[PDB]
Design an enzyme around this catalytic site. Structure first.
Site, short mmCIF file in Angstrom:
data_model
loop_
_atom_site.label_atom_id
_atom_site.label_comp_id
_atom_site.label_asym_id
_atom_site.label_seq_id
_atom_site.Cartn_x
_atom_site.Cartn_y
_atom_site.Cartn_z
N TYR A 43 29.47 26.93 65.68
CA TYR A 43 28.62 26.59 66.80
C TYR A 43 27.53 27.64 67.02
CZ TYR A 43 32.10 23.03 68.24
OH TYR A 43 33.04 22.02 68.32
N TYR A 83 30.46 16.01 71.78
CA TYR A 83 30.84 16.75 72.96
C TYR A 83 30.44 18.21 72.94
CZ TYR A 83 34.68 20.02 72.14
OH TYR A 83 35.42 21.15 71.81
N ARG A 84 30.02 18.77 71.81
CA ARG A 84 29.69 20.21 71.73
C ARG A 84 28.94 20.56 70.47
NH1 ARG A 84 34.69 24.62 71.98
NH2 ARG A 84 33.53 26.58 71.82
C1 LIG Z 1 36.33 28.68 63.07
C2 LIG Z 1 37.22 27.94 64.02
C3 LIG Z 1 36.76 27.72 65.31
C4 LIG Z 1 37.57 27.04 66.19
C5 LIG Z 1 38.82 26.54 65.78
C6 LIG Z 1 39.26 26.76 64.47
C7 LIG Z 1 38.49 27.44 63.58
C8 LIG Z 1 38.94 27.69 62.17
N1 LIG Z 1 39.65 25.87 66.62
C9 LIG Z 1 39.26 25.63 67.87
C10 LIG Z 1 40.11 24.88 68.77
O1 LIG Z 1 41.21 24.42 68.52
N2 LIG Z 1 39.64 24.64 70.03
C11 LIG Z 1 38.37 25.14 70.44
O2 LIG Z 1 38.09 24.88 71.57
N3 LIG Z 1 37.59 25.84 69.63
C12 LIG Z 1 37.98 26.11 68.36
N4 LIG Z 1 37.19 26.81 67.53
C13 LIG Z 1 35.84 27.22 67.96
C14 LIG Z 1 35.68 28.64 68.56
O3 LIG Z 1 36.26 29.61 67.69
C15 LIG Z 1 36.45 28.68 69.87
O4 LIG Z 1 35.91 27.65 70.69
C16 LIG Z 1 36.21 30.03 70.51
O5 LIG Z 1 37.20 30.37 71.51
C17 LIG Z 1 34.83 29.99 71.17
O6 LIG Z 1 34.25 31.45 71.26
P1 LIG Z 1 34.46 32.59 72.24
O7 LIG Z 1 35.29 32.04 73.40
O8 LIG Z 1 35.01 33.74 71.62
O9 LIG Z 1 33.07 32.71 72.47
P2 LIG Z 1 31.74 32.99 73.13
O10 LIG Z 1 30.59 32.75 72.20
O11 LIG Z 1 31.93 34.20 73.69
O12 LIG Z 1 31.28 31.98 74.18
C18 LIG Z 1 30.80 30.66 73.74
C19 LIG Z 1 29.58 30.21 74.53
O13 LIG Z 1 29.95 30.05 75.94
C20 LIG Z 1 28.80 30.42 76.77
N5 LIG Z 1 29.36 31.58 77.46
C21 LIG Z 1 30.33 32.45 77.05
N6 LIG Z 1 30.60 33.41 77.95
C22 LIG Z 1 29.77 33.12 79.01
C23 LIG Z 1 29.57 33.76 80.30
N7 LIG Z 1 30.19 34.82 80.72
N8 LIG Z 1 28.62 33.18 81.08
C24 LIG Z 1 27.92 32.10 80.71
N9 LIG Z 1 28.05 31.44 79.55
C25 LIG Z 1 28.98 31.99 78.74
C26 LIG Z 1 27.64 30.67 75.88
O14 LIG Z 1 26.84 29.52 75.74
C27 LIG Z 1 28.30 31.06 74.56
O15 LIG Z 1 27.50 31.07 73.42
#
Ligand SMILES: *Cc1cc2c(cc1C)nc1c(=O)[nH]c(=O)nc-1n2C[C@H](O)[C@H](O)[C@H](O)COP(=O)(O)OP(=O)(O)OC[C@H]1O[C@@H](n2cnc3c(N)ncnc32)[C@H](O)[C@@H]1O
Ligand SMILES: *Cc1cc2c(cc1C)nc1c(=O)[nH]c(=O)nc-1n2C[C@H](O)[C@H](O)[C@H](O)COP(=O)(O)OP(=O)(O)OC[C@H]1O[C@@H](n2cnc3c(N)ncnc32)[C@H](O)[C@@H]1O
Ligand SMILES: Oc1ccc(C(F)(F)F)cc1
EC number: 1.1.3.38
Lengths: 550, 550
Positions: free
Chosen positions: B98, B493-494
């Site tokens: 993503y 959805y995403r």
């Molecule tokens: C590679 C992969 C990914 C994966 C998965 C299996 C594999 C092999 N299985 C998943 C699953 O079962 N369910 C799921 O929901 N996701 C899955 N993923 C995808 C991904 O790894 C996970 O979703 C992961 O937990 C998402 O990343 P993380 O939570 O670490 O990330 P983030 O980039 O920090 O945040 C994502 C986006 O959210 C908005 N954001 C984040 N923090 C904020 C705050 N504080 N304020 C406002 N917006 C925020 C941003 O848009 C950001 O980019």
């Protein structure tokens, strides 16, 4: 018509009449009533508050208008914007205890969405959902299911009475007693008319059904929805559906509510708790049973006068005018075979599963002395369980209306704080409300409806609407309870037209940042401020706080 | 530092340098990185997209900044508004597939909130909830429960891997596999830093904890919450919480997720479906079981190459370069003792209850020829059921990371349409996605995760990130699938940084009214457009569409 009793802010009589003749042009004279009578629950008033706490003409409309369809709402909105004329959208207008149909700002036009926009638009069995217009009541939907024998595949979820609107209630965040009791959370796919007049559909209601010959050239309001519309609320991007519940952000024209499939096995029940202080042990017992799912539905813990009042007015129990005593409460308890507190529930599913749950349940409430377990059949013909047996299976009643007749010209007004699911807290909240209720000369009459991790405490204040003195006593009680509850860390989840501002001032963490940010979104989308100015304490920039707060 | 590779729109080098030296002033040099390496899943990059489909420097930061606390976010916001500098807030930055940590607009500052705002703030047993800062990962919260022996009272809910952020994921609307699978829907009480810089707390997080001596004089970010904060999400008035999920409305600093209580009895299982077309019967069987609640958790229906990829790279199964054949898929199925489609689930609760449900489940899936039921113990040491047995009970793993290594320099990219819970629809969606995958030279690898009335179809495209030709083939497939699915009534959805505008153009009902209304709200609250311009296709007024859409 011509000379109304109250006009809207800054509008002239010449302006009112140009507007009304324009509205009469669009929806016919048969759908526009000018106001130059409180009614009932069967013929709801649409001009003012029938269960009136403030003076009776305090919250009153200038005219009432019934759109024949969605385009009519679009036309009326443009006119409201042309003239700066505030509108108040009702679906059924059965919000008694919270204002009924009355507008927060006197002089508004009440928008009777329900009189003509009435249709159950779809009942989908494989999706186990339905799509409804403002005017479909609970009863109406129930009769729709019965006329197509859908009663054997799908069930409804009703609040205590049957006249409310499925959508009106859902946009208020109201509650019911089956496992699908959190009405708002079962919504998916709403259609809205914005302040500017543009039609918007939410979630996956924004993903258009693909082009096909049978649907070409249909106005937007009349088009089908794409398959996922009513099956997944989120769609893509910011999830904006909540800005349309308990708000002035737009006019709701259609909504999809999920329906629970027939569970193939149902059993209602009643546990009676002997003493006033058994509430503390009971709520401690409900906690883990609710959170662990032995308790499937939304159980209610009712106060003795709540059942008692359904059965008879106060004159029928004592000729006394002051609040009935503790010992007179124990007395009535025994005449009805009820406890001081009554717990109503239900078990859903195959026999094998009900059995195990009912055993854990019985067994848990056994550690309370004198406890007693009843199924409908075990109780009198007129009992509350016999009525809730239908309530907890989606069948609409009208019986609980009678508690409103506790006092002579009885009207109700809800005070609805939320409390934890802990005996200590529940007692503390009850303690605080009881004392204030006694000081004003009123019987305490409430019930707690049990959510997963929270409890909706509905204090049911009933009073005589022709009594000047007591009407002032209820106004003094209401505000005092608002403030005390706030000094104890509790807020109310819903309120009447007159307590809106006060209640919203209560949610002032960080210098009122929660209302500030509501004020910004509201001016963004409603620049002439014509969509329900005042709702939930949220006022558009051209309605000064000093002139309108209460 | 002084000269970054890419600068934000309209900023001068002298402006960038004043900004950065001001930010270094606040958070120290140790916390601000200028960019004048793709990393791993264990040391995630924060400058760009590691699973890069477009050129590698296409979505890249000017600098990364780690606020030490909430006030620092307040300070950085004010400078971003002084200079008009776009911010991109991450929690952990594990959004690979993503975009990872990358910013939609090159030249932004990546706000590493996680590096210092790390704390599990509260774990409340009677309320069965927790409070978390961006930086708490799933693993991290798991270790917090174990260090205080809370593992025997409360359970977590994890997505397939363990490094994600409980909050980052929940604001993304991600999914997990216990009964508390819908992450976002279990939240209750968020704290947000808005574009203007003001702190806001949602729902009942707006009703303040009453003044007491121990809490006097604490800055707002550091104050306790009132009792109902994390137990009833709604508060009073408009329910604004969804404007902070999948949006650019503010910076999320804390959140409250609800934790399932140990249900005293757990059993995970595997049903194998022998043929490629048994997906139709299986989904038809899952429908009523899901909707009737015999299926407690979020069941998954995985494709053979998904389990096979966890076990070994493609070179280990065939040296072939073209997509594996139907018959080679059957070949692999039999080597691993799996079907063509694999159904994973779990039973929660006392023995008596599991037993009756497991009987209905088995019995229903018995009408599918050659079907076969497995508990973990019945399978090999390295199996996916062994791994998912921990997944479906809230225990975090890292095993499923291996499927990304299906091809040489393997990277993933998710295509995530939503489908009905009907065999017919499921087949149709799968049909449409398999054919396009075959045209680009790619193996079809996916799974469906089963919601109450809908299914999340996660087509897992894996590709070699050093391959120019296939990288273009993955770009051609992604957009083609976007459009086809939309021509079949399905939306995603995403999505990833590059498909964001495309996918949002798909939700264009009524002339794009859903993005118009999102644009109004966004400009209202973010007048200098510095909070993540571009997220979910929502652009502030000063970023022309013509210059920035993709
Ligand atoms: C590679 C992969 C990914 C994966 C998965 C299996 C594999 C092999 N299985 C998943 C699953 O079962 N369910 C799921 O929901 N996701 C899955 N993923 C995808 C991904 O790894 C996970 O979703 C992961 O937990 C998402 O990343 P993380 O939570 O670490 O990330 P983030 O980039 O920090 O945040 C994502 C986006 O959210 C908005 N954001 C984040 N923090 C904020 C705050 N504080 N304020 C406002 N917006 C925020 C941003 O848009 C950001 O980019
Ligand atoms: C007297 C009483 C009330 C009651 C109850 C028991 C008794 C004895 N039990 C209730 C229960 O168990 N659960 C519950 O939620 N409410 C209960 N009530 C209160 C009331 O009777 C019901 O809530 C009733 O369904 C509410 O009225 P109705 O649905 O008929 O309502 P309405 O006034 O038309 O609408 C309420 C308000 O919502 C906004 N609204 C309504 N329609 C729209 C549209 N189309 N667009 C935008 N906003 C809309 C308005 O603010 C309106 O005033
Ligand atoms: O908002 C509400 C909820 C429940 C009730 C009742 F009837 F159960 F008391 C009244 C008002």
């Amino acid at each position: 018509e011509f000379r109304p009793l109250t006009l809207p802010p800054k509008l002239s009589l010449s302006d009112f009449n140009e507007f009304i003749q324009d509205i009469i042009r669009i929806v016919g004279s048969e759908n526009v009533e000018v106001i130059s009578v409180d009614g009932s629950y069967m013929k709801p008033t649409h001009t003012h508050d029938p269960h009136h706490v403030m003076d009776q003409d305090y919250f009153l409309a200038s005219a009432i208008v019934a759109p024949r369809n969605v385009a009519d709402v679009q036309s009326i909105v443009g006119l409201a914007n042309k003239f700066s004329f505030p509108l108040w959208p009702i679906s059924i207008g059965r919000n008694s205890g919270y204002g009924g149909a009355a507008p927060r700002v006197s002089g508004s036009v009440v928008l009777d969405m329900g009189k003509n926009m009435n249709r159950v638009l779809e009942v989908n069995v494989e999706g186990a959902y339905c799509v409804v217009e403002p005017g479909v009541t609970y009863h109406d939907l129930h009769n729709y299911l019965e006329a197509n024998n859908l009663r054997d595949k799908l069930w409804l979820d009703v609040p205590s009475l049957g006249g409310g609107s499925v959508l009106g209630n859902a946009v208020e965040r109201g509650v019911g007693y089956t496992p699908y009791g959190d009405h708002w959370m079962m919504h998916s796919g709403m259609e809205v008319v914005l302040a500017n007049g543009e039609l918007l559909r939410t979630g996956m209601g924004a993903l258009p059904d693909p082009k096909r010959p049978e649907t070409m050239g249909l106005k937007p309001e009349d088009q089908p929805w794409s398959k996922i519309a009513h099956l997944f609320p989120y769609g893509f991007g910011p999830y904006i559906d909540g800005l349309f519940s308990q708000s002035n952000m737009g006019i709701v024209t259609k909504i999809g509510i999920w329906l629970m499939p027939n569970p193939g096995g149902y059993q209602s029940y009643l546990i009676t708790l002997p003493k006033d202080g058994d509430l503390k042990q009971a709520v401690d017992i409900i906690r883990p049973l609710r959170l662990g799912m032995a308790l499937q539905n939304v159980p209610t813990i009712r106060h003795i006068l709540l059942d008692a009042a359904v059965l008879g007015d106060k004159r029928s129990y004592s000729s006394r005018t002051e609040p009935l005593s503790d010992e007179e409460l124990d007395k009535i308890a025994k005449q009805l075979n009820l406890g001081r507190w009554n717990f109503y529930g239900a078990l859903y599913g195959p026999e094998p599963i009900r059995r195990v749950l009912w055993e854990t349940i019985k067994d848990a409430f056994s550690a309370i002395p004198g406890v007693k377990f009843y199924f409908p059949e075990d109780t009198p013909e007129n009992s509350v369980l016999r009525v809730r047996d239908k309530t907890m299976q989606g069948i609409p009643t009208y019986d609980e209306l009678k508690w409103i007749d506790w006092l002579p010209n009885g009207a109700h007004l809800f005070f609805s704080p939320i409390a934890k699911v802990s005996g200590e807290d529940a007692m503390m909240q009850y303690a605080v409300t009881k004392k204030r209720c006694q000081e004003a000369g009123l019987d305490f009459i409430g019930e707690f409806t049990v959510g997963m991790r929270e409890m909706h405490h509905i204090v049911c204040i009933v009073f005589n609407k022709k009594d000047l003195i007591q009407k002032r006593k209820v106004q003094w009680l209401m505000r005092t309870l608002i403030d005390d509850c706030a000094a104890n860390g509790w807020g109310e989840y819903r309120t009447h037209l007159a307590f809106m501002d006060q209640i919203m001032e209560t949610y002032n963490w960080n210098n009122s940042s929660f209302l500030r940010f509501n004020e910004v979104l509201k001016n963004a989308v409603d620049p002439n401020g014509i969509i329900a100015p005042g709702k939930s304490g949220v006022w558009p920039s051209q309605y000064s706080h000093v002139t309108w707060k209460l």
